[PDB]
Symmetry: C2
Subunit: 377 residues, 2 copies
C-alpha cells in the first residue's frame, strides 16, 4: 500500500502537473506521481535544508557507490562506481552523449512513439532522426536498415515508455552486436527501470563484452521517487575509454546537478527500496484494474498489457470521437491525458494516461470519461 | 549586523567550501558566504519542501516580474519581465550566449584576472580568448584592438571580480558604442551587482539605445543570498530580437533550473532586500578592516581598495615566499585562499580571499597568516 496526500495538498505541491489545467480537471498527463514522497527521501531533503546545504557540491560524494550498489542489488549488474557520474537530468545526459560520443552530423535512430522531449533532443543536437515503429516491439531489421542508411546511434528507452515494454536479454545482446558491426552506439535510457512490475529489467550494458563497449547507460531516481525538479541523474559508463573521454570534457559541459538533488538521489538509492517495492505493487494493481475496466466503460478504447512504468498508451482510434481524443477528454470529461501526436505523427488518436495516483482518483477519472464519451458529438 | 551559525553548523553545511581542506583549515576560498541564510529565503525553501514541490516547474511563475522589480528598485533599470528567462546558472547562460548569439568560431575578449570558470567556458564553446589586463581598470583601447583582431563579443563582469570594481556609466556607454561599431556583443555578468558597498551599480543594457541592442545581461541571487547549489539564474534580454531568438531555441538548450531554486530566487528578490542591506554594510566593514590590517601583519602583502563583492585580490609578489603563496598559507597557516594562477598566468603570486564571513573568523585567519609568514623559508 501507499500513502497519498489529500487532494488539497496535491494541488498545493504547485508543480507543472497541478498548474497546467483548471481546478476542476484531474491531471493524468505529465510524468509526476501523486504518492506521498518516500519518507527516507523527504527526511534527507528536510535535514539538508535545516543544515543549509545550499552552496556548491561537496567533495567525497558516495552517490556513485549508492548507484552501483542499487544496480547490483536490483538487477545483478556490477557497475563500477568510478565510471558513474552526476548530471542534471537524463535528457541532458543524452544530449552530451549524442553531441560528444557519436560522430558529428550522424543520424540517430529514434523509435516511435517517442518520449516527446526526444524530438527536442534532435533539434538541440542538430541531428536528423530515423524513425522506426516500436509498437508491439522493435524489429532488429528496422534497426539494421537505419544503420545502413547512415545512423551511428540508437536511442533506446528500456523500459520503453510509453508502451510499458521490458526488453529481453538476448534481444539486447543482438542489438549491441548489430550496433558494433556498424560502429554505432546504443544510448540506453533506463529512467523507468526501477518501475518494472511484471518481468525483470536487464541492464543492456552487461549482457556481453560487446554491449559493455557499445552502450552508454543513463538513469535517475527522479521517476521512481518523484524528484524530477531536484535535478540529479546519473551517467553510467561501461568501459574505460568512455569514462576517460567524459573526464576530458570541459566542466562547463558536465555541470548542473543541484546540491539538494545529489542528497535526495543518494537517499533514494540507499534507503528507498522498501518504498519502491510497495510502489510497484500498487502500480501493478492499478494497471490490472485499468486494463479490464477502460474498454468496458469507454467503448472502442484499446490497451496493450504492460510490464513496467506508470504510463499507459490508450488507442482511441476505434472510437468515433471528432478531433483529438485528449482535447475531448479535457473539455468534456475534465480529465487531462497527453495527446499522442506529441509522440510522433502515428500517435494521433492515442493518449498517454498516468496511473501513478490513487485508485480513487483513477475511478473518478474513468467514470468522468465513461459518461462524457457516451454522447460525444 | 548579521547572524552566523556556529563553526560546527558551518562545517555541517557539507558544501564544497567546507569539504575541500582538512578540519583545521579555515576556508576563505570558493565563493560561498558564511552568513546564516536570509530568513525569508530559508522559510520559502522550508515551506516548499513541506509542500513536496519536487516535480516539474509550475506554470504562472512570477520570477521574471520579481527580477524586473528588483532591477527597478535597486538600480533604476526598468527591465521587461517578458524578456527575462530562467536558466540553471550564470555560466550556463554565458555558454548559451556565446554559442547562439555570437558568430561561429568568433574570438571572445576575456579580461584578466578572470573568474576561473571562464577558461572552461572558452574550452566548452571552442572559442579562442583574447586576453586584456583589467588590473586598475579596463582600457577601451585594449578592447578595440581585440575587436580589430576579430573578436565578436566581450565577457564583462560588472561588478568585476576578483578586483572588486564597479564600472562607470559613461564608460559602459562608450564600450557599447565601440562594440556596435564592430558588430560585437557585450555579455555582462552581473552576479555580484547586489553586493556593491561603495558606489552604485549601473546596468550597462540601460545606458543607451545602442547598449540595449548590444548587451545580453546575466545574473542570479546565488552570490548575494548564498544559494548557488539550488540552480536558478536569470537571463535578461534588452531588445525583442534577442528574446525572440531565445524563444526559438530548443527547450533542451534552455532547461536545467531546479524547482526549489526558482522558489528560493523569487523569495530572495521579493523579500531579501533588508538582509541584503545588512550584508553589504557588514562586508564594507570587513573590507575596511582587512585593507588596513593585512599589510601591517603580513609584510609585503598589497591590496587595492574595492567597491563591491566579497572577494579580495591580494598581491604577495613583494613577499619573499617560495612557490605559490596560496599553498604556503594552506600548509603553514592552515588558511585556504584561491591561487591566483587559476585566474590567468599573471595571477601568479596573488591570492583571492573570501571575506563573506565573521570578523572573528577573519581575525583568526589573518593572525594565523601573520605568524606563519614571519618565518617562511
Ligand atoms: Cl512526461
Ligand atoms: Cl522510506
Ligand atoms: Cl512516455
Ligand atoms: Cl550548469
Ligand atoms: Cl569561486
Ligand atoms: Cl529576511
Ligand atoms: Cl573571482
Ligand atoms: Cl541544472
Ligand atoms: Cl537540463
Ligand atoms: Na532526470
Ligand atoms: Na548562478
Amino acid at each position: 500500500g501507499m500513502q497519498f496526500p489529500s487532494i488539497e495538498d496535491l494541488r498545493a505541491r504547485n508543480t507543472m502537473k497541478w498548474t497546467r489545467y483548471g481546478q476542476g480537471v484531474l491531471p493524468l498527463w505529465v510524468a509526476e506521481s501523486d504518492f506521498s514522497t518516500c519518507p527516507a527521501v523527504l527526511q534527507a531533503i528536510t535535514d539538508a535544508v535545516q543544515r543549509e546545504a545550499f552552496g556548491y557540491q561537496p567533495d567525497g560524494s558516495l552517490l556513485s557507490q549508492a548507484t552501483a550498489e542499487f544496480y547490483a542489488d536490483r538487477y545483478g549488474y556490477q557497475a563500477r562506481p568510478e565510471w558513474i557520474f552526476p548530471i542534471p537530468d537524463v535528457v541532458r545526459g543524452l544530449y552530451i552523449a549524442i553531441d560528444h560520443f557519436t560522430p558529428a552530423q550522424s543520424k540517430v535512430i529514434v523509435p516511435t512513439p517517442a518520449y516527446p522531449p526526444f524530438f527536442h533532443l534532435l533539434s538541440a543536437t542538430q541531428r536528423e532522426g530515423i524513425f522506426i515503429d516500436a509498437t508491439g516491439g522493435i524489429n532488429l531489421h528496422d534497426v539494421e536498415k537505419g544503420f545502413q542508411a547512415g545512423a551511428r546511434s540508437i536511442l533506446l528507452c528500456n523500459p520503453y515508455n510509453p508502451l510499458g515494454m521490458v526488453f529481453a536479454p538476448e534481444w539486447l545482446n543482438e542489438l549491441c552486436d548489430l550496433a558494433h558491426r556498424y560502429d554505432a552506439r546504443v544510448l540506453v535510457d533506463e529512467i523507468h527501470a526501477p518501475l518494472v512490475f511484471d518481468g525483470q529489467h536487464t541492464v543492456a550494458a552487461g549482457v556481453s563484452d560487446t554491449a559493455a563497449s557499445v552502450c552508454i547507460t543513463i538513469t535517475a531516481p527522479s521517476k521512481a521517487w518523484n524528484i524530477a525538479g531536484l535535478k540529479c541523474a546519473q551517467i553510467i559508463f561501461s568501459n574505460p575509454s568512455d569514462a576517460e573521454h567524459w573526464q576530458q570534457l570541459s566542466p562547463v559541459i558536465k555541470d548542473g546537478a543541484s546540491t539538494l538533488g545529489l542528497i535526495a538521489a543518494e537517499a533514494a538509492y540507499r534507503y528507498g527500496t522498501d518504498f519502491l517495492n510497495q510502489e510497484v505493487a500498487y502500480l501493478k494493481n492499478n494497471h490490472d484494474f485499468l486494463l479490464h475496466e477502460i474498454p468496458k466503460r469507454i467503448p472502442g478504447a484499446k490497451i496493450t498489457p504492460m510490464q513496467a512504468t506508470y504510463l499507459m498508451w490508450i488507442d482511441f482510434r476505434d472510437t468515433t470521437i471528432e478531433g483529438s481524443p485528449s482535447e475531448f477528454f479535457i473539455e468534456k470529461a475534465k480529465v487531462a491525458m497527453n495527446d499522442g501526436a506529441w509522440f510522433g505523427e502515428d500517435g494521433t488518436g492515442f493518449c498517454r494516461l498516468n496511473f501513478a495516483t490513487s485508485r480513487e482518483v483513477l475511478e473518478e477519472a474513468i467514470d468522468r470519461m465513461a459518461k462524457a464519451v457516451s454522447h460525444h458529438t
